[PDB]
Amino acid sequence: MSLEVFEKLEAKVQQAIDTITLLQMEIEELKEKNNSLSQEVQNAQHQREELERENNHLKEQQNGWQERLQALLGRMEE
Amino acid sequence: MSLEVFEKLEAKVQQAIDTITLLQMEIEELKEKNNSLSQEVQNAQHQREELERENNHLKEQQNGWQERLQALLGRMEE
């Protein structure tokens, strides 16, 4: 093996290795960009499930007044 | 019923109504603020499920090179 065959090889080994790297970086970034979105889908869910609750508190309170308004009108019509 | 009993009533009716209102508004805003968050939890999911796919494309392609490197080294050691 001439210093010529050899060096054309040592340089391909590099590049194969550079890329196993780089690619492992790109993997690491998605593993993380996805963990960030997981976290987001969690605060969106913990927030949505907490609207449905305030919503029900109000609808109930408004059906409260919706009668206090109907009481009030009956008292006025007599 | 004096113009006095009457007007103290007509004014409470108002306020019962004003609030059936206002509250119906607050309902409408949550019905919507929640629909906005539903839409977000959908693009987060359609995006996360699309990372898991690019991720697997790379890990595969990196296991590609991970041998192209090992092929390359065997050729250099003979």
PDB file of C-alpha atoms in Angstrom:
ATOM      1  CA  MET A   1       0.000   0.000   0.000  1.00  0.00           C
ATOM      2  CA  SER A   2       1.623   3.252  -1.327  1.00  0.00           C
ATOM      3  CA  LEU A   3       1.453   6.512   0.735  1.00  0.00           C
ATOM      4  CA  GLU A   4      -0.998   7.330  -2.055  1.00  0.00           C
ATOM      5  CA  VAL A   5      -3.646   4.544  -1.754  1.00  0.00           C
ATOM      6  CA  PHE A   6      -3.441   5.005   2.064  1.00  0.00           C
ATOM      7  CA  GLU A   7      -4.046   8.781   2.254  1.00  0.00           C
ATOM      8  CA  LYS A   8      -6.980   8.626  -0.129  1.00  0.00           C
ATOM      9  CA  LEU A   9      -8.424   6.156   2.482  1.00  0.00           C
ATOM     10  CA  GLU A  10      -7.535   7.884   5.747  1.00  0.00           C
ATOM     11  CA  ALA A  11      -9.433  10.828   4.319  1.00  0.00           C
ATOM     12  CA  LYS A  12     -12.584   8.851   3.555  1.00  0.00           C
ATOM     13  CA  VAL A  13     -12.512   7.417   7.099  1.00  0.00           C
ATOM     14  CA  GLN A  14     -12.541  10.948   8.404  1.00  0.00           C
ATOM     15  CA  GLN A  15     -15.562  11.895   6.369  1.00  0.00           C
ATOM     16  CA  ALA A  16     -17.436   8.768   7.365  1.00  0.00           C
ATOM     17  CA  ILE A  17     -16.646   9.772  10.979  1.00  0.00           C
ATOM     18  CA  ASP A  18     -17.513  13.416  10.501  1.00  0.00           C
ATOM     19  CA  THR A  19     -20.931  12.421   9.672  1.00  0.00           C
ATOM     20  CA  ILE A  20     -21.740   9.756  12.134  1.00  0.00           C
ATOM     21  CA  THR A  21     -21.007  12.965  14.148  1.00  0.00           C
ATOM     22  CA  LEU A  22     -22.865  15.818  12.435  1.00  0.00           C
ATOM     23  CA  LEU A  23     -25.783  13.295  12.047  1.00  0.00           C
ATOM     24  CA  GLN A  24     -25.617  12.443  15.725  1.00  0.00           C
ATOM     25  CA  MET A  25     -25.842  16.186  16.352  1.00  0.00           C
ATOM     26  CA  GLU A  26     -28.867  16.499  14.070  1.00  0.00           C
ATOM     27  CA  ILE A  27     -30.401  13.591  16.014  1.00  0.00           C
ATOM     28  CA  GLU A  28     -29.632  15.291  19.344  1.00  0.00           C
ATOM     29  CA  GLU A  29     -31.352  18.495  18.096  1.00  0.00           C
ATOM     30  CA  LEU A  30     -34.553  16.657  17.138  1.00  0.00           C
ATOM     31  CA  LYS A  31     -34.549  14.564  20.301  1.00  0.00           C
ATOM     32  CA  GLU A  32     -34.665  17.931  21.997  1.00  0.00           C
ATOM     33  CA  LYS A  33     -36.854  19.985  19.661  1.00  0.00           C
ATOM     34  CA  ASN A  34     -39.360  17.226  20.185  1.00  0.00           C
ATOM     35  CA  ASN A  35     -39.002  17.215  23.944  1.00  0.00           C
ATOM     36  CA  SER A  36     -39.682  20.961  23.791  1.00  0.00           C
ATOM     37  CA  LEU A  37     -42.936  20.259  21.823  1.00  0.00           C
ATOM     38  CA  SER A  38     -43.901  17.472  24.167  1.00  0.00           C
ATOM     39  CA  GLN A  39     -43.624  20.013  27.006  1.00  0.00           C
ATOM     40  CA  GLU A  40     -45.772  22.453  25.024  1.00  0.00           C
ATOM     41  CA  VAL A  41     -48.508  19.840  24.345  1.00  0.00           C
ATOM     42  CA  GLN A  42     -48.581  19.395  28.072  1.00  0.00           C
ATOM     43  CA  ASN A  43     -49.186  22.957  29.058  1.00  0.00           C
ATOM     44  CA  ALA A  44     -51.694  23.253  26.290  1.00  0.00           C
ATOM     45  CA  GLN A  45     -53.533  20.235  27.641  1.00  0.00           C
ATOM     46  CA  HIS A  46     -53.242  21.221  31.301  1.00  0.00           C
ATOM     47  CA  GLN A  47     -54.597  24.607  30.208  1.00  0.00           C
ATOM     48  CA  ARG A  48     -57.464  23.318  27.978  1.00  0.00           C
ATOM     49  CA  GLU A  49     -58.697  20.951  30.683  1.00  0.00           C
ATOM     50  CA  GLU A  50     -58.714  24.024  32.959  1.00  0.00           C
ATOM     51  CA  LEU A  51     -60.811  26.143  30.660  1.00  0.00           C
ATOM     52  CA  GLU A  52     -63.501  23.438  30.401  1.00  0.00           C
ATOM     53  CA  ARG A  53     -63.668  23.839  34.206  1.00  0.00           C
ATOM     54  CA  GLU A  54     -63.928  27.634  34.427  1.00  0.00           C
ATOM     55  CA  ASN A  55     -66.384  27.466  31.522  1.00  0.00           C
ATOM     56  CA  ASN A  56     -68.610  25.085  33.495  1.00  0.00           C
ATOM     57  CA  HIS A  57     -68.281  27.280  36.593  1.00  0.00           C
ATOM     58  CA  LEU A  58     -69.632  30.291  34.571  1.00  0.00           C
ATOM     59  CA  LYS A  59     -72.432  28.529  32.548  1.00  0.00           C
ATOM     60  CA  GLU A  60     -73.623  27.357  35.989  1.00  0.00           C
ATOM     61  CA  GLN A  61     -73.348  30.806  37.519  1.00  0.00           C
ATOM     62  CA  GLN A  62     -75.141  32.270  34.452  1.00  0.00           C
ATOM     63  CA  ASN A  63     -77.919  29.743  34.753  1.00  0.00           C
ATOM     64  CA  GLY A  64     -77.848  31.085  38.273  1.00  0.00           C
ATOM     65  CA  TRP A  65     -78.699  34.627  37.206  1.00  0.00           C
ATOM     66  CA  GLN A  66     -80.894  33.449  34.321  1.00  0.00           C
ATOM     67  CA  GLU A  67     -83.343  32.563  37.094  1.00  0.00           C
ATOM     68  CA  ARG A  68     -82.637  35.295  39.493  1.00  0.00           C
ATOM     69  CA  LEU A  69     -83.771  37.305  36.359  1.00  0.00           C
ATOM     70  CA  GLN A  70     -86.889  35.246  36.035  1.00  0.00           C
ATOM     71  CA  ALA A  71     -87.688  35.475  39.741  1.00  0.00           C
ATOM     72  CA  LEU A  72     -87.112  39.214  39.469  1.00  0.00           C
ATOM     73  CA  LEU A  73     -89.638  39.474  36.576  1.00  0.00           C
ATOM     74  CA  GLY A  74     -92.388  37.480  38.352  1.00  0.00           C
ATOM     75  CA  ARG A  75     -92.124  39.737  41.426  1.00  0.00           C
ATOM     76  CA  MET A  76     -92.512  42.721  39.015  1.00  0.00           C
ATOM     77  CA  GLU A  77     -95.568  41.236  37.267  1.00  0.00           C
ATOM     78  CA  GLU A  78     -97.459  40.890  40.579  1.00  0.00           C
TER      79      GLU A  78
ATOM     80  CA  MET B   1     -96.707  49.177  43.561  1.00  0.00           C
ATOM     81  CA  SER B   2     -95.305  52.750  43.929  1.00  0.00           C
ATOM     82  CA  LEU B   3     -93.021  54.262  41.246  1.00  0.00           C
ATOM     83  CA  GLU B   4     -90.533  53.596  44.066  1.00  0.00           C
ATOM     84  CA  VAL B   5     -90.770  49.774  44.610  1.00  0.00           C
ATOM     85  CA  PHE B   6     -90.988  49.437  40.794  1.00  0.00           C
ATOM     86  CA  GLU B   7     -87.830  51.357  39.837  1.00  0.00           C
ATOM     87  CA  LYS B   8     -85.683  49.590  42.456  1.00  0.00           C
ATOM     88  CA  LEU B   9     -86.810  46.367  40.628  1.00  0.00           C
ATOM     89  CA  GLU B  10     -86.455  47.430  36.997  1.00  0.00           C
ATOM     90  CA  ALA B  11     -82.866  48.254  37.916  1.00  0.00           C
ATOM     91  CA  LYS B  12     -82.138  44.850  39.392  1.00  0.00           C
ATOM     92  CA  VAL B  13     -83.601  43.189  36.277  1.00  0.00           C
ATOM     93  CA  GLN B  14     -81.120  45.157  34.215  1.00  0.00           C
ATOM     94  CA  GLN B  15     -78.203  43.933  36.297  1.00  0.00           C
ATOM     95  CA  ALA B  16     -79.377  40.346  36.189  1.00  0.00           C
ATOM     96  CA  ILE B  17     -79.496  40.760  32.367  1.00  0.00           C
ATOM     97  CA  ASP B  18     -76.180  42.623  32.156  1.00  0.00           C
ATOM     98  CA  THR B  19     -74.468  39.643  33.508  1.00  0.00           C
ATOM     99  CA  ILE B  20     -76.212  36.865  31.708  1.00  0.00           C
ATOM    100  CA  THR B  21     -74.535  38.990  29.056  1.00  0.00           C
ATOM    101  CA  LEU B  22     -71.029  39.775  30.285  1.00  0.00           C
ATOM    102  CA  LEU B  23     -70.837  36.078  31.463  1.00  0.00           C
ATOM    103  CA  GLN B  24     -71.991  34.883  28.062  1.00  0.00           C
ATOM    104  CA  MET B  25     -69.189  36.970  26.662  1.00  0.00           C
ATOM    105  CA  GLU B  26     -66.611  35.447  29.021  1.00  0.00           C
ATOM    106  CA  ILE B  27     -67.995  32.015  27.946  1.00  0.00           C
ATOM    107  CA  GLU B  28     -67.527  32.928  24.272  1.00  0.00           C
ATOM    108  CA  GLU B  29     -63.937  33.981  24.879  1.00  0.00           C
ATOM    109  CA  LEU B  30     -63.035  30.677  26.580  1.00  0.00           C
ATOM    110  CA  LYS B  31     -64.883  28.651  23.962  1.00  0.00           C
ATOM    111  CA  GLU B  32     -62.515  30.348  21.600  1.00  0.00           C
ATOM    112  CA  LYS B  33     -59.295  30.572  23.607  1.00  0.00           C
ATOM    113  CA  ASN B  34     -59.725  26.832  23.992  1.00  0.00           C
ATOM    114  CA  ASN B  35     -60.324  26.282  20.303  1.00  0.00           C
ATOM    115  CA  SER B  36     -57.113  28.189  19.702  1.00  0.00           C
ATOM    116  CA  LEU B  37     -55.271  25.802  22.093  1.00  0.00           C
ATOM    117  CA  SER B  38     -56.878  22.753  20.490  1.00  0.00           C
ATOM    118  CA  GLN B  39     -55.489  24.002  17.137  1.00  0.00           C
ATOM    119  CA  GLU B  40     -52.048  24.429  18.726  1.00  0.00           C
ATOM    120  CA  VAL B  41     -52.108  20.873  20.271  1.00  0.00           C
ATOM    121  CA  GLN B  42     -52.753  19.676  16.743  1.00  0.00           C
ATOM    122  CA  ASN B  43     -49.805  21.329  15.043  1.00  0.00           C
ATOM    123  CA  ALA B  44     -47.618  20.253  17.938  1.00  0.00           C
ATOM    124  CA  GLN B  45     -48.759  16.667  17.461  1.00  0.00           C
ATOM    125  CA  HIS B  46     -48.574  16.679  13.651  1.00  0.00           C
ATOM    126  CA  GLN B  47     -45.086  18.130  14.100  1.00  0.00           C
ATOM    127  CA  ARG B  48     -43.865  15.715  16.844  1.00  0.00           C
ATOM    128  CA  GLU B  49     -45.041  12.682  14.867  1.00  0.00           C
ATOM    129  CA  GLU B  50     -43.044  14.119  11.985  1.00  0.00           C
ATOM    130  CA  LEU B  51     -39.826  14.463  13.938  1.00  0.00           C
ATOM    131  CA  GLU B  52     -39.979  10.820  15.087  1.00  0.00           C
ATOM    132  CA  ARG B  53     -39.972  10.082  11.316  1.00  0.00           C
ATOM    133  CA  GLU B  54     -37.049  12.335  10.278  1.00  0.00           C
ATOM    134  CA  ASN B  55     -35.210  11.044  13.359  1.00  0.00           C
ATOM    135  CA  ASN B  56     -35.624   7.421  12.250  1.00  0.00           C
ATOM    136  CA  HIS B  57     -34.555   8.411   8.705  1.00  0.00           C
ATOM    137  CA  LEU B  58     -31.250   9.775  10.098  1.00  0.00           C
ATOM    138  CA  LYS B  59     -30.470   7.004  12.723  1.00  0.00           C
ATOM    139  CA  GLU B  60     -30.881   4.624   9.776  1.00  0.00           C
ATOM    140  CA  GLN B  61     -28.699   6.723   7.456  1.00  0.00           C
ATOM    141  CA  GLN B  62     -26.084   7.057  10.290  1.00  0.00           C
ATOM    142  CA  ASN B  63     -26.115   3.284  10.763  1.00  0.00           C
ATOM    143  CA  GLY B  64     -25.545   3.388   7.045  1.00  0.00           C
ATOM    144  CA  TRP B  65     -22.222   5.282   7.387  1.00  0.00           C
ATOM    145  CA  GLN B  66     -21.372   3.560  10.705  1.00  0.00           C
ATOM    146  CA  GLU B  67     -20.493   0.533   8.442  1.00  0.00           C
ATOM    147  CA  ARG B  68     -19.314   2.351   5.439  1.00  0.00           C
ATOM    148  CA  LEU B  69     -16.730   3.467   8.099  1.00  0.00           C
ATOM    149  CA  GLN B  70     -16.138  -0.036   9.181  1.00  0.00           C
ATOM    150  CA  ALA B  71     -15.873  -1.278   5.632  1.00  0.00           C
ATOM    151  CA  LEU B  72     -13.440   1.592   5.041  1.00  0.00           C
ATOM    152  CA  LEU B  73     -11.255   0.549   8.012  1.00  0.00           C
ATOM    153  CA  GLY B  74     -11.047  -3.169   7.028  1.00  0.00           C
ATOM    154  CA  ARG B  75      -9.895  -2.214   3.528  1.00  0.00           C
ATOM    155  CA  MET B  76      -7.201  -0.024   5.209  1.00  0.00           C
ATOM    156  CA  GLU B  77      -6.049  -2.846   7.533  1.00  0.00           C
ATOM    157  CA  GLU B  78      -5.370  -5.221   4.646  1.00  0.00           C
TER     158      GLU B  78
END
